[PDB]
Nucleic acid binder design. Structure first.
Lengths: 133, 136, 37, 192, 176, 126
RNA sequence: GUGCAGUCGCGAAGACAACCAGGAGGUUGGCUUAGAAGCAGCCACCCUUGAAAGAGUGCGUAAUAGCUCACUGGUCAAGUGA
RNA sequence: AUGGUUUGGCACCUCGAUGUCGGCUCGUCGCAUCCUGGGGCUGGAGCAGGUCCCAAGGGUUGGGCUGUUCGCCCAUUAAAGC
């Protein structure tokens, strides 16, 4: 098992996606193309990946929802989050933007209802200092 | 490096080291403080080395109060000189400290870092000291 | 084996003991291993 | 706030002086005197351990009911004498008070809460003056600082006090001061 | 103490003889002798077990109690089960072959080294790069296993030398 | 865990159990939180899944008829309440047991009676 | 190191050590840099499943991976910490 | 803080005399070890090192310049100790 986050628009071999899983001994060229097809169906957001590997070097990848921080950054229109959270605030967010992200995270979260999921995103929004409304 | 701006007399008798402190025996500004336990002239530099030591450990937050000010001068005759021919020129400024005197006071959110920081300052002072807090 | 008048438990695994009247510090990491002398 | 008087046993002093008082301390007893509106100075020796226990629990301003040779007298701890180094209790002054009497004393102040992250909280004044009935004395007062921002001064008048309690000290005293947290640039400047 | 406050169970096949502070245990694997300290009294429960008792609670009795009890259990276990220490050798060209009661090691030295077995200890080689040492006394078994461990200096870079099976030796990397 | 917290934990477990129709005793040694979370997902829709201290339940059992489960607290204790329906969790716990096989159903309690592993399996079918 | 005495914490609702299991989702929290993922450094330091899981006490890695820990429950059986 | 060898402070023994620098000959003692002997840790792969601990048995060169102690330089040496 290995955890990585790869941008939607590129799958080149890189030190982050090279020796990270290369030392485990798994094929790389096949992985880039298969991941590319799914992430270019979405085409929108960077998608985290979790590669599951067996004893025969056969690998099954897990493609889940985009990161909450990147989801909140794109839901706010800003490029980079606040370097001084909760004192200097880059942007403002609305409940419906929170809920749609929470609904998106609901397939990826351990929450029960949307309300719990919304609070989880609210906690993430506080992490980089995005005020919630 | 604290020195008085001006002093009425520049050459003075050595401050005497008898008794224990009568005033300033209790922390007043901060929440923790360093209390002396032996008589010694806490000079000008030792205060600077200790105060810097506190700031390095507590980093950003907090405020430090220095209740001791070195305004009492001390003299030394020029090196390689026979005795006589008057009193030497003042050299270093010391502040007379008696047991019970509270030198430094430090205010910081968490206790553990504050006690460690004050402990480093103690190792830069000639006296045996102990850290004392505000309550009874 | 550092020989100093002051010996302290550098890391959490370090243990302070006493052998034959002399204080030591024994740790899995040999660098931390010191002795009072 | 009505509190129950603490019971102590006190006996009079046969000999008074630095010779006798030092020996009494060596025996585990703290010499004391008792004066009041009744105009009657009495010299007593309390047990040090129980007196320390009463003070530790009920604060420095403790209401007492002494037993002086079988007589019960209500007394208040006016003041103490703590040795600077040994931190003993060398001597205690006890003031007699009748129930329902207005007494002026000093109580401590505690700051409870969570300040904003960019804030350093400084307590200028440890104790404030209070006039209250002898049995209605509060052991300590509380000041709450939560979500307070910028330079906000919590003066003495702003404190909330129990019923029947008056603020003898003027309200202008600045008990709590909140300011912006110093930076490492600011720390390495003052003191030079 | 807690260790000393636990009776020593003697299985049915084991014989225990007590003469005051002198103790001797006889069993299938051989015979052993022991002596206990003055403060501790050693007596036998009629169930057929061993019990140790300390009269007072100072350092000496409290410290000696745990030792004296666990000294007997090692004594009884030695004469029923015995102790076998298993070793294994790492390195290229490192060989072990047994000669009589003695054991020989080929550790890369210009000459081969030989270890003689003292009384009550026996060496049994299983493979060229794996062997074992067996005996009665836990101390003597561990003692000779110590001496064998000192044959080659510790090697953090390649791990060549003697080892215990479960031993995990730290290794660094020699780059420059 | 203060003494007041220990006591109020008994009350909440008792309050939870009193409205709970039946209880199931299971063993959980060797189950990761993620898989445990799926069991929480497989049970939290209707039932309630909990793991509590052996003696904490014991005092939380003297009130009602779960005084007869004292012998089922030896070892790890995982208890399933069924506040909604009766057998809904009985199928789920068995299915989760078959999925993991690191889970052993120590026993169960229903309508004032205590049953063994086979018997609660019988009531799981019924 | 030990002798004495005094406070405070936890403890048969089984304390402490040890042994078994679990130690998670958002998530690679934002800034920062080549990188920076709990483990240069700075800011905040939350929410959720919940028994318990820290914006992570340490080691390890270029960065991941990995070993752990804090912490929770099970056996054990009177004391255990400052 | 040790040591008492350096530059000093004091003026206590000696001014009806305690000969003062270098070199030679002859030693003797300390260890705060230069080589040889035994170890720990290494940012110790090997050769070679670095630092620290134990150790005083033996050894510790010949020349150019200067009255020189000291120092620079030429050849060696296991080392050219204080």
């Amino acid at each position: 098992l290995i955890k990585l986050q790869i941008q939607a628009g590129q799958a080149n071999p890189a030190p982050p996606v090279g020796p990270a899983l290369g030392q485990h001994g798994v094929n790389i060229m096949e992985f880039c193309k298969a991941y590319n097809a799914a992430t270019e169906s979405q085409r929108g957001n960077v998608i985290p990946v979790e590669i599951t590997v067996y004893e025969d070097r056969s690998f099954t990848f897990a493609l889940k929802t985009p990161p909450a921080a990147k989801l909140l950054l794109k839901a706010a229109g800003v490029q980079k989050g606040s370097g001084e959270p909760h004192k200097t605030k880059v942007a403002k967010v609305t409940w419906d933007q929170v809920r749609e992200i929470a609904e998106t995270k609901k397939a990826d979260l351990n929450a029960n209802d949307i309300d719990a999921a919304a609070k989880i995103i609210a906690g993430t929004a506080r992490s980089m200092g995005i005020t919630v409304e | 490096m604290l020195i008085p701006r001006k002093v009425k007399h520049r050459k003075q008798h050595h401050p005497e080291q008898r008794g224990i402190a009568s005033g300033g025996t209790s922390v007043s500004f901060g929440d923790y403080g360093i209390q002396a336990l032996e008589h010694a002239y806490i000079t000008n530099r030792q205060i600077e080395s200790a105060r810097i030591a506190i700031n390095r450990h507590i980093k950003r937050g907090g405020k430090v109060w220095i209740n001791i000010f070195p305004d009492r001068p001390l003299t030394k005759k020029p090196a390689e000189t026979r005795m006589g021919s008057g009193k030497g020129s003042p050299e270093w400024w010391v502040a007379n400290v008696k047991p019970g005197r509270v030198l430094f006071e430090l205010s910081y959110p968490d206790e553990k870092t504050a006690r460690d920081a004050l402990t480093r300052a103690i190792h830069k002072l000639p006296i045996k000291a102990r850290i004392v807090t505000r309550e009874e | 084996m550092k020989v100093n008048p002051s010996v302290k438990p550098i890391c959490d695994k370090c243990r302070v003991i006493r052998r034959h009247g002399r204080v030591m510090v024994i740790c899995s990491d040999p660098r931390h291993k010191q002795r009072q002398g | 706030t009505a509190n129950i008087p603490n019971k102590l046993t006190a006996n009079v002093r046969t000999r008074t002086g630095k010779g006798a008082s030092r020996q009494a301390r060596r025996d585990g007893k703290v010499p004391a005197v008792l004066y009041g509106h009744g105009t009657d100075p009495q010299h007593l020796e309390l047990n040090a351990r129980d007196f320390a226990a009463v003070l530790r629990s009920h604060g420095t301003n403790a209401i007492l009911t002494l037993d002086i040779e079988g007589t019960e007298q209500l007394a208040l701890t006016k003041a103490l004498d703590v040795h600077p180094i040994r931190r003993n209790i060398q001597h205690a002054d006890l003031l007699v008070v009748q129930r329902g009497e207005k007494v002026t004393v000093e109580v401590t102040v505690l700051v409870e809460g969570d300040a904003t992250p960019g804030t350093l909280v400084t307590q200028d004044a440890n104790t404030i003056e209070i006039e209250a009935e002898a049995l209605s004395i509060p052991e300590q007062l509380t000041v709450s600082v939560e979500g307070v921002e910028a330079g906000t001064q919590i003066t003495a008048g702003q404190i909330s006090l129990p019923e029947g309690v008056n603020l003898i000290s003027d309200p202008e005293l600045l008990v709590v001061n909140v300011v912006e947290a110093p930076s490492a640039e600011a720390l390495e400047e003052e003191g030079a | 103490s807690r260790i000393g406050k636990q009776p020593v169970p003697v299985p049915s096949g084991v014989d225990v003889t007590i003469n005051g502070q002198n103790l001797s245990v006889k069993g299938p694997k051989g015979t052993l002798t022991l002596d206990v300290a003055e403060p501790i009294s050693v007596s036998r429960a009629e169930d057929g077990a061993i019990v140790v008792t300390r009269p007072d609670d100072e350092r000496r009795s409290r410290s000696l109690h745990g030792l004296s009890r666990t000294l007997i259990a090692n004594l009884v276990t030695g004469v029923t089960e015995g102790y076998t220490q298993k070793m294994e050798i790492f390195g290229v060209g490192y060989r072990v072959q047994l000669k009589g009661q003695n054991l020989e090691f080929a550790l890369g030295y210009s000459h081969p080294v030989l270890i003689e077995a003292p009384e009550g200890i026996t060496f049994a080689v299983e493979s060229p790069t794996k062997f074992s040492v067996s005996g009665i006394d836990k101390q003597k078994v561990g003692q000779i296993s110590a001496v064998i461990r000192r044959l080659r200096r510790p090697d953090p870079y390649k791990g060549k030398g003697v080892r215990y099976e479960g031993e995990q030796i730290r290794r660094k990397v020699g780059k420059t | 865990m203060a003494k007041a917290d220990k006591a109020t934990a008994v009350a909440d477990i008792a309050e939870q159990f009193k409205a709970s129709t039946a209880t199931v005793v299971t063993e959980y040694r060797g189950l990761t939180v993620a898989n445990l979370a799926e069991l929480r997902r497989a049970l939290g829709d209707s039932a309630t899944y909990t793991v509590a201290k052996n003696t904490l339940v014991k005092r939380a059992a003297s009130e009602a008829g779960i005084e007869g489960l004292d012998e089922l607290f030896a070892g790890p204790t995982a208890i399933a309440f069924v506040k909604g329906e009766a057998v809904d969790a009985a199928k789920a716990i068995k299915k989760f047991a078959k999925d993991n096989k690191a889970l052993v159903i120590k026993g169960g309690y229903m309508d004032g009676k205590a049953l063994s592993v086979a018997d609660v399996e019988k009531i799981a079918d019924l």
